[PDB]
Amino acid sequence: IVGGTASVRGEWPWQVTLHTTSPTQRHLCGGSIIGNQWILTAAHCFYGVESPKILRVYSGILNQAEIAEDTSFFGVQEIIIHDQYKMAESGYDIALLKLETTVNYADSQRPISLPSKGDRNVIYTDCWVTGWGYRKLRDKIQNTLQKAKIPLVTNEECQKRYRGHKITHKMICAGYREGGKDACKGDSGGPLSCKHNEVWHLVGITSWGEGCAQRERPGVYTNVVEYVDWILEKTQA
Numbered sequence: 001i002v003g004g005t006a007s008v009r010g011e012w013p014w015q016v017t018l019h020t021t022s023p024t025q026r027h028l029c030g031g032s033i034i035g036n037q038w039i040l041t042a043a044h045c046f047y048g049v050e051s052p053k054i055l056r057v058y059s060g061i062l063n064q065a066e067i068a069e070d071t072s073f074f075g076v077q078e079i080i081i082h083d084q085y086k087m088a089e090s091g092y093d094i095a096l097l098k099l100e101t102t103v104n105y106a107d108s109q110r111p112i113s114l115p116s117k118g119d120r121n122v123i124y125t126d127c128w129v130t131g132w133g134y135r136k137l138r139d140k141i142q143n144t145l146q147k148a149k150i151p152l153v154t155n156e157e158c159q160k161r162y163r164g165h166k167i168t169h170k171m172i173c174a175g176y177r178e179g180g181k182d183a184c185k186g187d188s189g190g191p192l193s194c195k196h197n198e199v200w201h202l203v204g205i206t207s208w209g210e211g212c213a214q215r216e217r218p219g220v221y222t223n224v225v226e227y228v229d230w231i232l233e234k235t236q237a
């Protein structure tokens with residue numbers, strides 16, 4: 001997260017850190033708890049990943065330092081990538097991680113509500129992006145989960161900043177005209193939480209962006225409301 005600040009412990013209970021154990025353990029991507037055995041994240045976060053056996057999901061984490069060899073984690077039973085996903089910039093950057101065990105909810109770890117199809121008219125004005133990603137283009141994974149409030153921008157506005165790409169209605173962008181605040185490397189798979197009517201909704205999933213926090217270069221996210229049917233279908237045993 002560029003231009004953000006340290007999060008308060010338990011402030012973003014749906015946020016999880018996805019680690020890979022190969023060659024040695026490290027933070028791979030962010031993710032969101034949406035069900036007792038389900039993590040919603042980015043599909044492009046599994047590039048090179050031949051098996052779910054090298055994955056570990058940690059919930060209720062604030063500082064990466066809390067993670068050690070003796071720290072409990074959730075195993076991943078299955079990685080579910082959207083069948084139309086090819087690459088982040090082309091859309092469909094969404095994936096589900098079915099955990100080997102169930103998450104026992106508590107104040108430090110609970111699921112975030114998915115947006116409703118009826119809410120596609122809502123004008124979320126209180127949106128936050130979170131993660132342990134870079135605080136600058138050339139950086140490293142942060143110890144403390146960061147947060148940054150960022151305004152949504154119209155898809156038409158976003159397309160203007162990415163005349164090289166196709167910003168579809170299945171994507172949603174957020175950023176400042178002058179930049180300064182944005183998600184960055186390591187935040188991928190992270191949630192783009194927006195508080196509407198006193199309730200947090202998983203509006204987007206951190207996907208891609210040209211550089212990080214550059215002026216006239218909004219962060220691009222998977223537009224979650226467009227995948228509620230997919231999520232339900234893939235979550236229904």
Ligand SMILES: *[C@](=O)([C]([C][C][C][N][C]([N])[N])[N]C(=O)[C]([N]C(=O)[C][C][C]([C])[C])[C]([C])[C])C1=N[C]=[C]S1
Nearest residue numbers: 088183184185186187188207208209210211212219
């Ligand atoms: C993800 O953590 C990052 C998320 C960066 C989001 N950036 C932003 N909001 N400004 N994703 C990537 O790095 C992504 N590629 C790009 O963003 C480059 C896009 C330009 C247009 C070429 C992936 C597809 C590689 C991570 N994802 C993988 C490792 S960290």
